[PDB]
Amino acid sequence: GFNLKVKDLNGSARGLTQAFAIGELKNQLSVGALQLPLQFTRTFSASMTSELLWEVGKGNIDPVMYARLFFQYAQAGGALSVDELVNQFTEYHQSTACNPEIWRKLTAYITGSSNRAIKADAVGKVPPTAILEQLRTLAPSEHELFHHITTDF
Amino acid sequence: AIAALRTGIVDESLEARASNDLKRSMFNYYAAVMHYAVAHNPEVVVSEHQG
Amino acid sequence: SVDSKMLQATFKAKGALAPALISQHLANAATTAFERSRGNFDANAVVSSVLTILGRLWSPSTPKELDPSARLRNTNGIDQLRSNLALFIAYQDMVKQRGRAE
Amino acid sequence: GFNLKVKDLNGSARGLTQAFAIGELKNQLSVGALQLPLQFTRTFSASMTSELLWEVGKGNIDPVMYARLFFQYAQAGGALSVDELVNQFTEYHQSTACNPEIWRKLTAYITGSSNRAIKADAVGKVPPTAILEQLRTLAPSEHELFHHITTDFVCHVLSPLGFILPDAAYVYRVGRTATYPNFYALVDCVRASDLRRMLTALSSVDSKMLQATFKAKGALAPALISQHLANAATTAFERSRGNFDANAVVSSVLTILGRLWSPSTPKELDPSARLRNTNGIDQLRSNLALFIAYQDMVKQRGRAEVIFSDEELSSTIIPWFIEAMSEVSPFKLRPINETTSYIGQTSAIDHMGQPSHVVVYEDWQFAKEITAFTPVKLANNSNQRFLDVEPGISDRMSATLAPIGNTFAVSAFVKNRTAVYEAVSQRGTVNSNGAEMTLGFPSVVERDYALDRDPMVAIAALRTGIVDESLEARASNDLKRSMFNYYAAVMHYAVAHNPEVVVSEHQGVAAEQGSLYLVWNVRTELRIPVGYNAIEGGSIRTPEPLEAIAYNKPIQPSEVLQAKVLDLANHTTSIHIWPWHEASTEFAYEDAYSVTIRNKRYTAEVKEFELLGLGQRRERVRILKPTVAHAIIQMWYSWFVEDDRTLAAARRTSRDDAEKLAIDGRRMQNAVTLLRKIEMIGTTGIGASAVHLAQSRIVDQMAGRGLIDDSSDLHVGINRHRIRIWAGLAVLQMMGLLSRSEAEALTKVLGDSNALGMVVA
Amino acid sequence: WRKLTAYITGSSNRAIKADAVGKVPPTAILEQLRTLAPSEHELFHHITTDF
């Protein structure tokens, strides 16, 4: 029920309330009057309610939906914040792209036997999942996903 | 959490989760007023509060 | 982005040994996709500047030298990013909290 | 600022300074005069700056570049030293070549299945890398590399036949190393140069060969790729060898060189009959420029004997098989005045007019540039941590630093102190001396302070002179590391200018073996306060040598040096750096600053991320403790120091009106200046954020405190200033340079210094 | 003058080409000139500065 009184609105609620909003606790209450007049004409969405999920189920995948999914985690995300998200992520990414081998394992784990490319045959192992976890071995999911997303790629 | 935010000097008792979050609340709460101040009645300038 | 429909694996009778080739392929231009991958400038920067400018325009009290400007704006992004001032208080949100950007 | 006075130059700085350089602390100051006259005509490279990396990415490989890379590690190398390098390395090598089996593993790990040679097929496994680490199993990298290099040799006969596989790219730094001087040092070079083959060797030969069978087609390398790798490999190893004294290999050569050099005979030794004319020696005789071997050999130790001359050596092998021709380590191979071709000067002194105050030194970068990177190690298995640009911090550090560029690159210090002399008159005239007057180099300060020794102080004995000696594997043994080059600071500009030679071995109280250097003569002006000696015959004899440069007219450099700095991140992203760890964490600094009023603390805290302040923390940004500024600013710290003390003192006893007033404003000027351009550095931003920070925090601490009707603040007042100075460390915090001493020492001086207003802002 | 000359830093005593800085505190300086001339009536104490 926190609140304020017009004289005390600054007088007390003065902190929450925006005359502070700027630096100017200051000498006189912001204001007076002056110069270039306008109103922006925009905030953007309605985001609330609108509860919903996604499946990032499959590898042929998404160009860009997932990061949006990533921003989601972000807020749930223990680790703040997003900026953090992106950069830590850049780290995992770096590791995968850079490294040929780590890929020896993924490779066996499929068509991945020894020899190569085992031509026409088709070899029955591929789970959804069940690579995925095979993948899930290399770097533990700080927030994995790059457990799922890299798996999708 | 308003409780300071009303009381106003900022809680500030930071922790990775902590006011740093009262910070998280704060921008939107500042946003509660404005926006219905936003619609209705565009009447503009004003100035930078020179200060 | 990119990705490939490609040596499948050999095809070459038929599809077929991806030497490492599925593995190799996955990288080879992958993180190499990664080195056609990059992305650069200020996340913090990338606008901070943009906002300062927006504020100039906004600001009754001049942006002075700063100015709406010549292919600067008319941009067909900015105008209505000028418009978009509605996500106002950047400079309010930028100005108060911090004390600067350039 | 360690230094010396001509009478006391030996009198105190006597240790650092070279009249000692030899044994002869002795009875009389070396010198007199004498016999075989010459100047060598050579040190070699310019090695500094010249930062840069290599990739030793691929197996078909290098004959000899890598050891040169190895010398690099060597200096970074925890384990000292090179000699150590080569020999420990010989141990790993021995193990690989000797052992067939260890090779069972490598072998499976490729074509390596069971059976052999699995004929035409081609089998998809080969990573760059990704053998490499397979290899990385057998012997842990004392400094691996032989993790990478053996892998490359492993890559070198191994990929020519459809067994070439994991694709790699590699990077490893440029590096600042010295003059380069020590007798050993030649020896290190020599062993390395053994690598320089012995190695190269391993690289040498190699095969395009039973491929594997070919034999329908290529084809089962029975063990044969494995077998092949050894079979003549370490067997290459047993056509591999390399032999004689790394320490020996010249020690003898040098003694001989000294004979030739030595006025006072080499006696029986002699230039000799196919001995020399050698077409290696002559100009190794020439090459005496890497003089002071015998000086460096004679002093330190007390002997060597040719031992092995043969007669037809040395020669034929005897002096001719030589590391120096190889020119591996950034010892610095080159013509003459380059390493001269940068030097730094002082003139100018006055009145007396030569003796009193005159530092030589030089030009410098303040190239703005420094860097961000993240260490995203992609694997453990070892340390490496690929990395890139992460900019925002790197650039702005730099961004700031350009107004940093404004000042305190050298001549600010030189000029100030130097002119600072007019204050003070007057013309004492010879009582002080003389002074070392001359010295403040990037040249070392950089060296062990960049190596964490902080040897700029290290002179402290080296001035004080009996040798620190408090050995530890890293320890003075390093003041030792600094010492040869620091001895080298004087000589070399004594070296260019004015060849005037012999002199003699300082016969001594002891200890004739050979122990000589050229009498550092030239010409001289007439009228002397100089040195131990008085000598108006054109020149001074000199066991100086520099004073003749003290004598030695200002000249003042050409010399354009200014470091450069690297670009690892763009190359990283492609591939891994290992200059690391070197750099450390190392995201300091974070400070809390009080605000001045009555009866109230008015404290203000800075949160480190905050000047960057982009929210909130970046987790593992690491920066080098990058040097250069540290050294430069450090000369700064001293002279604002030096002078002040001096002016202060003059006001003290002369004593008597005329002096003070001037010095005191002028002290005045210095202070005003500082406060303001401190403004400029300190504010200028990003600093300003400090400054606001000084405001936001204090202000709400004011509002937070409660009653602000009497809050002033900011218009004016030092409190006006105090903001400017809080900005002043602050900018000068998050430099890798300073330290925090600077401030408060600054702060103190500046503060009372004056600051007197007005004038902000 | 002698003192200005003298406050010409700290004189020309080493006369040379030298004096380079600090001229706002010799308005404040020409306060230092107050010993030669008393100046509660700041005027000259301020004014003496000007020239």
PDB file of C-alpha atoms in Angstrom, chain D residues 19 24 28-34 502-507 517 519-521 532-533 535 540-544:
ATOM      1  CA  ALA D  19      85.070  -0.096 -12.895  1.00  0.00           C
ATOM      2  CA  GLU D  24      89.186  -4.736  -9.787  1.00  0.00           C
ATOM      3  CA  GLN D  28      93.418   1.609  -8.385  1.00  0.00           C
ATOM      4  CA  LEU D  29      90.682   2.309 -10.786  1.00  0.00           C
ATOM      5  CA  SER D  30      91.428  -0.014 -13.579  1.00  0.00           C
ATOM      6  CA  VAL D  31      92.616   2.312 -16.285  1.00  0.00           C
ATOM      7  CA  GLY D  32      96.089   3.780 -16.366  1.00  0.00           C
ATOM      8  CA  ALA D  33      96.620   3.235 -20.089  1.00  0.00           C
ATOM      9  CA  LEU D  34      98.208   0.709 -22.488  1.00  0.00           C
ATOM     10  CA  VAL D 502      93.492   0.447 -25.279  1.00  0.00           C
ATOM     11  CA  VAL D 503      93.987   0.472 -22.425  1.00  0.00           C
ATOM     12  CA  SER D 504      94.930  -3.025 -21.269  1.00  0.00           C
ATOM     13  CA  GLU D 505      93.771  -5.935 -19.204  1.00  0.00           C
ATOM     14  CA  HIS D 506      93.773  -4.382 -15.767  1.00  0.00           C
ATOM     15  CA  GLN D 507      96.775  -6.275 -14.737  1.00  0.00           C
ATOM     16  CA  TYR D 517      88.631  -3.496 -21.977  1.00  0.00           C
ATOM     17  CA  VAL D 519      90.333   2.738 -22.299  1.00  0.00           C
ATOM     18  CA  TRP D 520      87.448   4.776 -22.793  1.00  0.00           C
ATOM     19  CA  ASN D 521      89.198   7.892 -24.139  1.00  0.00           C
ATOM     20  CA  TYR D 532      88.550  10.595  -9.981  1.00  0.00           C
ATOM     21  CA  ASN D 533      91.116  11.715 -12.404  1.00  0.00           C
ATOM     22  CA  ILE D 535      92.847  14.898 -17.493  1.00  0.00           C
ATOM     23  CA  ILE D 540      89.247  11.281 -20.408  1.00  0.00           C
ATOM     24  CA  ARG D 541      90.940   7.976 -20.203  1.00  0.00           C
ATOM     25  CA  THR D 542      88.237   6.530 -19.080  1.00  0.00           C
ATOM     26  CA  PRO D 543      87.212   4.082 -16.685  1.00  0.00           C
ATOM     27  CA  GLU D 544      83.882   5.709 -17.320  1.00  0.00           C
TER      28      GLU D 544
END
